[PDB]
């Protein structure tokens, strides 16, 4: 089990997607779609691994921490198999893959990945040309630049307010959690000097009925931070606590949960800025796309209030695949081994066994590779057919190990939660 960077080599692609084509580059609106094509040496063999490494600057989720899933174990799309498994440090911005034993069965192992990653504002406080962005695929550093220009701050009279989601966690449709999500609020950021500022949070809007968003003391938690003199808020809303006041004790009596999922802050005569952190739980829904809004109001004596807020919108028996494989097992022993070859053309008929009802067909590609989805839980039949003229069924059930030997023409296999991919077939071709 070795690193094996230095035996893979690829080409990469790393491009900015203006997703919401503002022509500005927000870290909060628009993500990094990173594709590759990574040709494994014939050298590499299981248990061997490489890296896939990224800059500071950014991170392989966006508001939800769980869509980690989305990066996940790298597969061979004709077969089913897995060719290497995944695994995230994302403490040290880090992707290690380890191979399977797909490298010590095939030669010529090739892999593609297609992933949206995320720009991470931790280290882009403010607006910041030619901001840079890497991805290292083994050994190859793949690089691209963006501009980085985020949206003012709301502004009214000497009032002054921004907010933005930070955390999404939601279970549309489980009723025992919900989720939760995050939200962060700078009260007066252009530090003014404002009498009798109070700031009403609200899971409210006139134009949202249905609102997933829920704010009461049973549910909701609120942190309370003074920023320093001459402290630059992070423009993306990524807050390191450490370098702020925690105040929360000092708002005994100015904390007021009222109705409409409101909640009210008397922070009375300020002339710091300070950042509210408001963690709270999803309402539950049935609906298929709810939305949450959350506004934040800052108001003050002499001056119009001030008014922000955020929106976002989400979604709400199992079947398996059977295969996989039709070879050319040359030295007639009936075992898969490696530098023996697919075999494309071979007919593949699929029926459940219990019914005798047919439920896929496939013809094998040029790999030998082939699959039948949709499969529930069951007992299938499996029938190859049209095999190469020449050629003979190599001896079946040999080797001791169902998953590297040949079936023969016709044999039965059970689906049993998860995929079987064991109903190979093996053939030779006699020369004497
Ligand atoms: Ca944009
Ligand atoms: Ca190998
Ligand atoms: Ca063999
Ligand atoms: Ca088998
Ligand atoms: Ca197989």
Same mark, same amino acid.
């Given at each position: ?31 990094? %779609? ?7 040496? *014939? ?90 962005? %890497? ?14 220009? +985020? ?8 009032? %002054? ?29 252009? *530090? ?6 109070? @700031?009403? =949070? ?10 997933? $968003? ?15 003199? $001459? ?6 809303? *990524? ?32 002339? %710091? ?52 494989? =039709? ?6 022993? $009936? ?23 047919? =439920? ?38 040999? #080797?001791?190990?169902?998953? @590297? ?11 049993? #939660? ?13 020369? +004497?």
């Amino acid at each position: 089990s070795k690193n094996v960077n230095d035996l893979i080599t690829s080409n990469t692609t790393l491009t900015v997607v203006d997703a919401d084509n503002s022509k500005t580059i927000v870290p909060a609106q628009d993500y990094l %779609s990173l594709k590759s094509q990574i040709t494994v040496d *014939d050298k590499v063999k299981s248990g061997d691994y490489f890296t896939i490494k990224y800059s500071d600057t950014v991170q392989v989720y966006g508001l939800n921490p769980e869509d980690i899933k989305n990066i996940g174990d790298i597969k061979d799309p004709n077969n089913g198999e897995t060719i290497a498994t995944a695994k995230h440090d994302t403490a040290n911005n880090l992707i290690t893959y380890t191979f399977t034993d797909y490298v010590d069965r095939f030669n010529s192992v090739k892999m593609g990945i297609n992933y949206s990653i995320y720009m991470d504002a931790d280290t882009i406080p403010v607006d910041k040309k030619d901001v840079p962005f %890497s991805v290292t695929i083994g050994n190859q550093i793949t690089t691209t630049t963006a501009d980085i220009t +985020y949206p003012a701050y709301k502004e009214a009279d000497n009032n %002054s307010i921004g907010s933005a989601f930070t955390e999404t966690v939601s279970h549309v449709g489980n009723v025992e959690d919900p989720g939760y999500y995050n939200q962060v609020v700078y009260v007066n950021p252009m *530090d003014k000097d404002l009498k009798g500022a109070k @700031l009403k =949070v609200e899971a409210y809007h006139p134009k949202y009925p249905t609102n997933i $968003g829920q704010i009461n003391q049973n549910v909701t938690n609120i942190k309370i931070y003074r920023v320093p003199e $001459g402290y630059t808020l992070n423009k993306g809303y *990524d807050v390191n606590t450490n370098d702020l006041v925690d105040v929360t004790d000092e708002f005994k009596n100015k904390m007021t949960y009222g109705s409409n999922q409101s909640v009210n802050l008397d922070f009375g005569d300020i002339t %710091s800025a300070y950042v509210v952190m408001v963690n709270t739980k999803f309402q539950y829904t049935n609906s298929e796309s709810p939305t949450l809004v959350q506004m934040a109001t800052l108001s003050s004596t002499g001056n119009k209030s001030v008014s922000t807020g955020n929106a976002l919108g989400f979604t709400n028996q199992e079947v398996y695949k059977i295969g996989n494989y =039709v070879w050319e097992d040359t030295n007639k022993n $009936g075992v898969q081994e490696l530098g023996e070859k697919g075999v494309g053309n071979v007919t593949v008929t699929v029926f459940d066994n219990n019914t005798n009802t047919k =439920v896929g067909e496939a013809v094998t590609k040029e790999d030998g590779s082939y699959l039948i989805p949709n499969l529930p839980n069951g007992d299938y039949r499996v029938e190859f057919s049209n095999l190469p003229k020449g050629y003979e069924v190599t001896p079946s059930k040999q #080797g001791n190990n169902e998953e @590297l030997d040949s079936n023969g023409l016709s044999s039965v296999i059970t689906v049993n #939660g998860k995929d079987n991919l064991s109903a190979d077939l093996g053939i030779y071709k006699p020369k +004497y």
